[PDB]
Nucleic acid binder design. Structure first.
Length: 49
DNA sequence: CTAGTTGATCTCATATCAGGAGAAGGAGCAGAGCGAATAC
RNA sequence: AUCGAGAGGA
DNA sequence: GTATTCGCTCTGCTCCTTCTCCCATCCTCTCGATATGAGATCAACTAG
């Protein structure tokens, strides 16, 4: 699950609620946690179809 | 001499796209050149 | 430790 | 008996195809993946 996505537990949480889960409110999300490692998918250019 | 004990070692057996450049080969055509082969 | 990958530095 | 061809070979010439090679130096870091014993043989004992 990508963090801060709709299906993330951090979805819709207030800055209170994030801090109260030990999360940074300024953290944008948009990445995955695989084996504890934060992984970000890079958009890949391709020639339109 | 001469049999019995001790280790090592081997076999065998048990289941279940937006590269490029150059060198080497083969291909097909083109002709040259010489043997034979009709033929005047 | 090896391999690969990635991100960087000059 | 010499023209004249003429079939056949011998290169040889472009060209297209294949294939094989190469693509700066050095340095740092992180991160993920990556059996067991029985029997036989032989050789050293280990003594008789």
């Amino acid at each position: 699950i990508m963090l801060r996505s709709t299906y993330c537990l951090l979805n819709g949480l207030t800055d209170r609620d994030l801090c109260e889960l030990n999360e940074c409110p300024l953290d944008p999300g948009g990445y995955f946690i695989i084996n504890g490692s934060e992984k970000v998918l890079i958009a890949q250019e391709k020639m339109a179809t």
